[PDB]
């Protein structure tokens, strides 16, 4: 009967395809097209890193704007005092292939996880005064490529095993196991009511999670691997960094691709995808060494950082957009304002 | 094993969606309201500046 | 006449010299590059405060006593300027007969440490002969065979390195040229050393120190050229 | 114009950075190797020589040193097929060991396939590979037969003739060496293909049995150590 | 963490002696170490300070030249050698394990002393004795000569409470911030040169001697300290 079943779904995703074109009257450039665009938007590298050894894999900023942690291939996980430069922790990593690092927002865990399928969450308040691993979440069976914290107890983790989790950190245990996706998933951005989720893979679609049900709501489709997803800050909206040189705009509740940030120039592969505070800047790093900032609005360039000598690995914007901090293969991190 | 994929796909199917212009005015609603927000866009004064 | 050139030659290399001077600093740092880089920074002194003594010298608005600093100078920007391009030579053939140790268990210093030792050892004596050569007649006559000496085995060091590294790609065009590339910087160096210390054997350039300046810069002209070639 | 507590908060930076040049002096020291293969290949074998002679977890280290240098080598479990996403993280490993089983016929056309995307890989464009053709005593037992001929999986071994090259100096079969010798260049020919700087396949003869192997991917590293040398310092 | 001190008693004036406090439990060689003292019957004074590798080492005007700190990291033991000793030296002798990072609390674990008997941004604590009773609200004030809000945002203020007969106990630290096992119902406020410490419904287990320390600049000044007794 996988003749029947594959008509069916042949039919099911012909549905989909067209109530999702049913409801494209008008094109997102067709709105923006009359508001004034941003201009140029030139950013300064105020504060360089230069504590790692080898090439930085990830970064997260902590909820102060503040403290920002960064994984490095050398097995270290320094958390960084950006107002200062000053260096607040070094963590030596069991296992020198990372992938992400992650940053609780109540300041106390620092999550990182690699090529060894472990996430490892290490306390950095505790009594002894050096930061242990808490706990090491052992379930996946592919690398981890994305961990980010729900609160002090849960974390959502994408792996290469075409599966994302949810573990409750005390009893080390996957709560929830997300199934969907045909590929490695690279990225993952939670929501900010932190009900929902956004995880990209490199089946070339995007997949919108329910933590709390378990289910996957709806899949957008890209035309290769999804490097890096972010969510619009309203909630209603996320970005796809690709490796095609698309960041492409898709919208939950309408379901579609608003838009394409696309530029005949440049032929590389997005790695990190981030946006300002308004949502009005998508910024996205690229193998091109350096990072672009795009109108999220209007679809056309508006900046290019251009500091790094090495590909832009991560990017994150802080929570009150004060600042953008790059991290590359060339050991540094960058905080452009 | 293909079962999966139809229910999925059948879930998936019957969502409410909105038009794209209600979309996109929603997305331009918010980064006007938020527009004076994020020093990115508008720069803010080096004194204000912690960086 | 010869300083219509002369002064313009001498502007051309201090330009090639601020040249490879900033291209080395804004391209990555080696080991080698350091050396390259301090080679640069003597030519720099040297022709900065030769270009000062043309400009103080055709205004004439001076006493001529950069000339004093000069000579003094000039024999340590020649035992330096040949040790650094010893020591290159040398870490050189550690390159290639020491692989492992180079590029792993290196003091990722001690090329900013051999040299400004070599400054270190190479002014300290090259001063010294100067207040040595002029002041006191008849006494530390054997301080100036130290500086003869320590000149020579220098060369021959270089040698023994260079064409060492040239049995050894023959052992294994433009790659050709690199490998005894820096020799030819030490073709004048080692000349001028023996200009100098020969000056009064056979004195008669008087006409021709004009045209020598010009070479001397002309010396100084494609210098910072070669720096980029054996420096790219 | 820093505080006590801002003052105190640099000092333990600037530890923090001593320990992280003492680190970098040890990862500086240290020579990373990737170790690929199949299930087929003879691969743990290598690990387990090189091992004693000198769950679900992804990565696996078995370090070794020779002759006073320290290697970490890494083979990578519990992934899946798929490649081409956690292979970037190994743009900087001094060396990328292939493991081939030479024995099996069948599968080795798929092994050619696996070093071609290995070879002409956008990250490992840079990255020399040392390539072991294991299980040799298996072959030779398997061409002494003649129930297996390269001709019935690859059609050119009756067309070729061994080179007017070296050859294995004690008493091997003449055409067990053809045999082996056409393996080494069927992977010799994907090499030099496409090559670019840092980027050389060095061919070794091994089994599960050779005690040497360690001193074979020491020679192999410090020739693209000293290759790198002499590129990045201009010397090439 | 526990940190045990030893090294008191009797000294003739003018001897010499080695205090030696004991490091068990936490990363000894990460912290700064500092050591105070209390009088017989007086407040707390700072007298040395080694940072965490040895590299800055502060004294009391008080204390200069006579006493030399140092630590032993691999045995994880500070030592106070105390040479030309004094009258005025008598004292409990606490080491305080202080760490410093952003968002670091100093002054977290106090030692239990050890007695020794020998046979400048002043900090003012008018209120020398406050009686309450349980279950209603106390307010402790401290003023200061030189405004402790530095440029960079923070007030380096330190609120210490000392139960009878143990060792003083950190509640507040940078004039906001509770310390980690203390109650809720502890509060800090104020501005530089003006700063209130706040109890709400207090219970008794927190009565006694409550100090206030300077952290701007070295030498670090206490206060008098308000004895709040039942
Ligand atoms: C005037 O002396 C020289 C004569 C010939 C060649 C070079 C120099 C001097 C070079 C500067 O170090």
Redesign the pocket.
């Given at each position: 009967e996988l003749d029947q079943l594959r008509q069916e779904a042949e039919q099911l995703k012909n549905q989909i395809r067209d109530a999702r074109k049913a409801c494209a009257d008008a094109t997102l450039s067709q709105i923006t097209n009359n508001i004034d665009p941003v201009g140029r938007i030139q950013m300064r590298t105020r504060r360089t890193l230069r504590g790692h050894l080898a090439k930085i894999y990830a970064m997260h900023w902590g909820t102060d704007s503040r403290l920002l942690v960064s994984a490095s291939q050398d097995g270290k996980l320094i958390i960084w005092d950006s107002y200062t430069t000053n260096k607040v922790h070094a963590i030596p990593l069991r296992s020198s292939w990372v992938m992400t690092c992650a940053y609780a927002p109540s300041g106390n865990y620092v999550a990182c996880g690699g090529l060894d399928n472990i996430c490892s969450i290490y306390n950095l308040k505790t009594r002894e005064g050096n930061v242990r691993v808490s706990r090491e979440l052992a379930g996946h069976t592919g690398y981890l490529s994305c961990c980010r914290f729900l609160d002090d107890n849960q974390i959502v983790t994408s792996s290469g095993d075409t599966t994302c989790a949810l573990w409750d950190i005390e009893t080390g245990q996957q709560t929830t196991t997300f199934t969907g996706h045909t590929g490695d998933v690279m990225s993952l951005s939670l929501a900010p009511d932190t009900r929902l989720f956004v995880s990209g893979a490199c089946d070339a679609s995007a997949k919108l999670w329910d933590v709390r049900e378990g289910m996957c709501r709806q899949t957008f489709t890209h035309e290769s691997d999804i490097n890096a997803i972010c969510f619009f800050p309203n909630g209603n909206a996320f970005a796809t960094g690709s490796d095609d040189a698309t960041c492409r705009l898709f919208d939950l509740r309408a379901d579609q691709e608003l838009m394409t940030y696309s530029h005949d120039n440049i032929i590389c592969g997005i790695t990190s995808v981030s946006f300002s505070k308004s949502g009005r800047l998508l910024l996205a790093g690229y193998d091109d060494f350096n990072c672009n900032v795009w109108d999220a609005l209007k679809a056309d360039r508006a900046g290019v950082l251009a500091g790094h000598d090495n590909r832009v690995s991560c990017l994150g914007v802080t929570d009150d957009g004060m600042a953008v901090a790059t991290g590359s293969w060339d050991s540094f991190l960058k905080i452009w304002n | 094993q293909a079962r999966k994929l139809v229910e999925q796909l059948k879930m998936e199917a019957n969502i409410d969606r909105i038009k794209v212009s209600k979309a996109a005015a929603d997305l331009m609603a918010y980064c006007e309201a938020h527009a004076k927000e994020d020093p990115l866009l508008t720069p803010v004064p080096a004194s204000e500046n912690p960086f | 006449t010869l300083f219509l050139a002369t002064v313009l030659v001498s502007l051309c290399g201090l330009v090639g010299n601020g040249t490879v001077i900033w291209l080395l600093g804004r391209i990555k740092r080696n080991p080698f590059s350091v050396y390259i880089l301090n080679l640069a920074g003597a030519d720099f002194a040297?022709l900065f405060c030769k270009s000062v003594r043309f400009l103080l010298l055709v205004l004439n608005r001076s006493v001529a006593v950069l000339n004093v600093l000069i000579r003094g100078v000039?024999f340590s920007?020649?035992l330096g300027?040949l040790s650094l391009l010893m020591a290159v030579s040398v870490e050189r053939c550690l390159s290639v007969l020491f692989p492992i140790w180079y590029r792993c268990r290196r003091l990722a210093q001690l090329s900013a440490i051999a040299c400004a030792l070599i400054w270190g050892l190479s002014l300290c004596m090259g001063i010294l002969v100067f207040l040595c050569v002029h002041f006191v007649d008849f006494l530390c006559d054997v301080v100036n065979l130290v500086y003869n000496g320590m000149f020579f085995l220098t060369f021959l060091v270089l040698c023994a390195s260079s064409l060492a590294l040239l049995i050894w790609v023959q052992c294994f065009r433009i790659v050709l040229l690199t490998v005894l590339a820096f020799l030819v910087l030490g073709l004048?160096?080692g000349?001028?050393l023996l200009?100098?210390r020969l000056s009064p054997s056979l004195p008669c350039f008087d006409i021709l120190l004009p045209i020598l300046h010009l070479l001397?810069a002309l010396?100084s002209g494609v210098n910072p050229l070669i720096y980029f070639f054996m420096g790219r | 114009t820093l505080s006590a507590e801002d003052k105190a908060a640099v000092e333990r930076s600037k530890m923090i950075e001593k320990q992280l040049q003492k680190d970098k002096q040890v990862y500086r020291r240290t020579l990373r190797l990737l170790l690929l293969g199949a299930d087929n290949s003879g691969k743990s074998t290598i690990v387990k020589q090189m091992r004693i002679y000198h769950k679900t977890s992804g990565i696996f280290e078995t370090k070794f040193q020779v002759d006073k240098v320290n290697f970490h080598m890494f083979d990578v479990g519990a992934q899946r097929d798929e490649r081409r996403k956690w292979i970037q993280c190994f743009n900087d490993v001094t060396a990328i060991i292939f493991v081939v089983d030479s024995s099996d016929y069948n599968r080795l056309q798929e092994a050619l396939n696996d070093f071609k995307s290995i070879w002409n890989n956008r990250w490992l464009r840079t990255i020399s590979v040392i390539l072991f053709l294991n299980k040799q005593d298996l072959l030779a037992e398997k061409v002494l037969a003649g129930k297996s001929k390269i001709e019935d999986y690859f059609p050119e071994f009756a067309r070729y003739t061994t080179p007017e090259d070296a050859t294995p100096e004690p008493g091997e079969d003449p055409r067990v060496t053809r045999a082996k010798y056409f393996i080494r260049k069927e992977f010799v020919d994907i090499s030099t293909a496409s090559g670019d700087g840092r980027h050389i396949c060095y061919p070794h003869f091994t089994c599960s049995v050779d005690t040497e192997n360690a001193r074979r991917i020491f020679n192999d590293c410090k020739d693209i150590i000293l290759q790198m040398n002499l590129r990045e310092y201009n010397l090439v | 963490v526990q940190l045990v001190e030893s090294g008191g008693g009797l000294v003739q004036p003018g001897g010499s002696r080695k205090l030696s406090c004991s490091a068990s439990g936490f990363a000894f060689s990460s912290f700064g170490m500092h050591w105070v003292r209390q009088a017989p019957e007086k407040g707390l004074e700072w007298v040395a300070y080694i940072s965490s590798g040895s590299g800055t080492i502060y004294y009391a005007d008080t204390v200069k030249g006579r006493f030399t700190i140092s630590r032993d990291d691999p045995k994880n033991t500070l030592f106070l050698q105390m040479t030309s000793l004094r009258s005025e030296d008598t004292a409990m002798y606490y080491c305080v394990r202080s760490i410093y990072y952003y968002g670091s609390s100093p002054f977290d674990f106090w030692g239990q002393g050890t007695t020794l008997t020998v046979s400048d941004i002043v900090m003012t604590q008018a209120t020398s004795s406050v009686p309450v009773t349980p279950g209603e609200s106390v307010s402790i004030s401290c003023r200061s000569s030189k405004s402790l809000l530095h440029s960079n945002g923070n007030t380096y203020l330190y609120w210490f409470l000392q139960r009878p007969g143990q060792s003083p106990q950190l509640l507040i630290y940078r004039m906001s911030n509770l310390a980690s096992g203390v109650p809720d119902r502890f509060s800090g406020s104020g501005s530089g040169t003006a700063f209130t410490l706040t109890i709400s419904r207090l219970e008794a287990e927190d009565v006694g001697v409550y100090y206030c320390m300077q952290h701007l600049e070295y030498p670090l000044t206490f206060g008098a300290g308000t004895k709040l007794e039942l």
């Open positions: - | - | 040297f000039t920007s020649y300027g004048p160096l000349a001028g200009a100098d001397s010396n | - | -």
